Amino acid sequence: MKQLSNLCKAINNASRAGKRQLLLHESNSVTRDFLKQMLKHGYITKYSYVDDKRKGKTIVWLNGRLNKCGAICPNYKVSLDHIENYRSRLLPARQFGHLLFSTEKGIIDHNECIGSNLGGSILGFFY
Amino acid sequence: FDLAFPTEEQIKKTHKTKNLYAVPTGYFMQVLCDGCKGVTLCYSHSQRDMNCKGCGETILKSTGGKARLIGECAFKKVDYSF
Amino acid sequence: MNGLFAANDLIKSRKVKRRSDPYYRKKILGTKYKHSKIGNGPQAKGIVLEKTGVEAKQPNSAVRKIVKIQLIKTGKKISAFVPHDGSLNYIELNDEVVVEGFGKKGHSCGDIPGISYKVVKVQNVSLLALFKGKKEKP
Amino acid sequence: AKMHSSGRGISTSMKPFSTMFPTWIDVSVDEIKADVLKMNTKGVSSAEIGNKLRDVYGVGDCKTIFDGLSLSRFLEKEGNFIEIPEDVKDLVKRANILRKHINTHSRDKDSKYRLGLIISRLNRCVKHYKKKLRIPSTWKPKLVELI
Amino acid sequence: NGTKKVGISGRFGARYGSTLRKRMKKVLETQKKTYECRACGKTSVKRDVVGIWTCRSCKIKFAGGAYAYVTPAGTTFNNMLKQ
Amino acid sequence: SRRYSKAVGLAASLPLVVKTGKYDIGFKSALRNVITKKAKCIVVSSSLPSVKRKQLEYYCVLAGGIPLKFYEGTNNALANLCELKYRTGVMSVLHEGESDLLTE
Amino acid sequence: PVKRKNHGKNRKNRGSCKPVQCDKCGRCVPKDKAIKRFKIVPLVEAGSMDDVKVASIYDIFEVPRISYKNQYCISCACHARIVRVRSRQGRKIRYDG
RNA sequence: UUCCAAGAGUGUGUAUGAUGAUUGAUGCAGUUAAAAAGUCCGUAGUUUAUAUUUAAGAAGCAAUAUGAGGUGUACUGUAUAGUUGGGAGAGAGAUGAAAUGUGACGACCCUGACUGGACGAACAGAAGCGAAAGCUGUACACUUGUAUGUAUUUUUUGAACAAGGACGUAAGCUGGAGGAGCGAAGAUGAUUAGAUACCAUUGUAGUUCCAGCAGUAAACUAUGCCGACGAUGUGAUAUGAUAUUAAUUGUAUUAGAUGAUAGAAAUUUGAGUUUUUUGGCUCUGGGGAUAGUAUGAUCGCAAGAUUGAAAAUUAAAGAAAUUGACGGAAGA
């Protein structure tokens, strides 16, 4: 996951300094499903990406609500009974935070992973 | 000052590979001789010496950058004519 | 060596690095069976041969009273330290003693040099009680 | 970023997006198919052909005047099949110059270091080709001997 | 093939010393070797007498050294005559 | 930079003869082409015997205007210059292609 | 700790330099890690400037000067007070000519 | 004598766990405290950019741009030393100060000619090239890098590496050539309680060339290799565009200053993006001392090199920085 970690490190540098926009020189189908989950819960504004018969580009507009985003490598196979263990490790409080799992239904939250009783490989976290 | 919508000065600053949209900088041209009137197909950055059609002599020459026109020989770019 | 399918290379590497633990190295070689001074037990028995004193290190100054014995289980010669005041007057030669250790993992503690054992019983009479005066020596 | 040296240069050449049929040519299409078979049967490289075809004739991309076929693929349809590709053949020719050079000058050991880098660059291409079944399996390049 | 590092001097056996047999291996390699003929171009020149080298095919004798076909002090004086 | 200077003399013109022309080697074949006037040019090496060499100079004037070119090398060198099966004393050129051997 | 930024000398992107020799002691020193001075002295003294004027067969002439370059190791240099110990915060000043 | 803790129990001792984030997958550290092989190539094992069709890589042009990159033939530069023809007739040379040594079979100085060996002054830089060790007289021959431009071929051929392979200042070894200056070992003159050391006079191996072994350095940027993002100002090397005699601009390296971060601190565009710890891969360390010492195995003509413990011991060893005291240390 070279492309996913390269995305997350550029955001933490940008969101801490307080910039408005961001331009990256690589696009990927894993990163596009990442941002749609970030767009759904309301952490960022709109974003866009350009195809140019090359690696592709990505343009995102921030609003200043991110604390830290991250990625985990290697991608561990987690069963259904250990999601309660991982959630205590990587999250500050029980009331908020999010996780992304690469389940066969799609990249979904840990709330939907428990609610549909599906365990899979883990991707990353953001809050 | 938008990154998604660049202005024409910011296009003039950037490298040709790191633009928002990939457009090359090579085109084809037609050179007109001064004494005789012959036209010849040519290139922006040619790698070899072209000669005039009639009166075979020096017209372009290979350089590190753009091609050098020897003498007074006016040219223009050509394009699609469908 | 961080990978999902790298368990064979991870276990082989971490066994090598574990050998530089100074406590774990003696467990592999089994030095407590090879080079033990007293054997493997809490106490021992012996026969007294000498009654001699030593002199402690700097900056203190005294004379520490000891005794050179010979063990029964192994047959070696060793020295032990008489641990209380006026207790050497009970001890005669050609007698039996019982020896207990100091409790600092095989090292010498205090300012007594090179000695790691102390006497506890003489003729099946407790020396801690005999200093108190409860019993009498036959 | 380079294979056998430390460089990070970016100086390349970019072909355009969605190239259509060129109309500014002055020589007809059947004549431009005639001379390219004269060049290949005479023995010039396929990389040298695209250089000349851009300069003196006026067509830049060689995919459009043909029927959407690449240049090495287009030659196969008319019997001129290339057995060993060109990246192998230029490397064995460059290697024979240095073995010629060492037989005169023996004390030059800077050149002996240069032989190891190019031969190791040769074997990484041949070993991958035998996986793809491009060259026959019992093929060895012909090298000059060393005295 | 049977010998590890002695070579042609294995005929001497286990006598005459160690460094005396090293000096025999340098000389006996260049004496028994055949060389190219400068006249005909074939590799048939052999030695038969001290200072006389002759070819098998063209049968032309050449003067030379004791144990080598060319002498290292013999070739340096050819270069100064070429200039 | 890298630039290899091209060979200019008959060292360059001779490998073009073997690819695009017809030839024969051997002294016996070299005498036959001179008598029947079917040879164009003759290339000799430096290692011919002195008797067989001057016989070819005397006969080439008698056969006509056939030229003779002198190579400075051994038979093993001439087989390394252009690829031949065996080492050769003399070379006889029956027909040529794109070579500039006669115009030189 | 480290005392100076460039460690002893001003050499970068190289591997080695051939050594030169001091004039007073005569020990080998690399050419970067040397102390070199330049001075120009005339042949005649200023104290003898007027006395040559009464002895000149010529009418007017110029008095000539010669130059010199010297090299030293740093042991000889500080002993002859060519180069002195400076303050720590004042070590970073560089007097180019 | 009196007080405290536990209480039908309470202490002493030998193993073995936890304390220990001092075995670290979660989860340690590798400039200076212990710790990155001298530098590259390359197999097994580990690993991977992709909207499945395209970047990167490899091959190939132009400017014959630019460069103490390498190897070989031919010439050339002054100086030190020696042989010799003229002139002349007492000291020359060294040191803080002197002594042995040295000169009327004539030195030392100024001149006229010769033979040999070593080395390229001044220009000469916080400037260039090389994987590292390294690389400065001229003209040709052979041979080789990185970077900038660009509608050129192929289509994923990639990064790092147990086994194996090559190069590697300086000494040191066997064989042949040479030997001007310098010079370990050895021998003399002074200083000294004593000098077999510093000072001075001699003097051999060596340092020069060719063919081979050998494989150690404070081989140091004491900082492994690949990949994404970063604040202004003054410079340097190469090269392209705009523009035209007046400038401001693109890419790749590199020097320095001020802020900002991080750090135990000195310091610092990475040694930053870390207890809100994860992009991939090889090697090394676990309190001092014994000790890079014994023993075994593999290399080498030898000297020696790589691998590499323990018994008995000991409460400290160590890194950065403030205040004093001292200097046979320096200035005002």
Ligand SMILES: [Mg+2]
């Ligand atoms: Mg205890």
Ligand SMILES: [Mg+2]
């Ligand atoms: Mg590599």
Ligand SMILES: [Mg+2]
């Ligand atoms: Mg060095």
Ligand SMILES: [Mg+2]
């Ligand atoms: Mg620790």
Ligand SMILES: [Mg+2]
């Ligand atoms: Mg230290």
Ligand SMILES: [Mg+2]
């Ligand atoms: Mg250290």
Ligand SMILES: [Mg+2]
């Ligand atoms: Mg010079």
Ligand SMILES: [Mg+2]
């Ligand atoms: Mg550069």
Ligand SMILES: [Mg+2]
């Ligand atoms: Mg491994």
Ligand SMILES: [Mg+2]
């Ligand atoms: Mg190895």
Ligand SMILES: [Mg+2]
């Ligand atoms: Mg070697």
Ligand SMILES: [Mg+2]
């Ligand atoms: Mg070492």
Ligand SMILES: [Mg+2]
């Ligand atoms: Mg080191």
Ligand SMILES: [Mg+2]
């Ligand atoms: Mg290193």
Ligand SMILES: [Zn+2]
């Ligand atoms: Zn014209």
Ligand SMILES: [Zn+2]
């Ligand atoms: Zn013969």
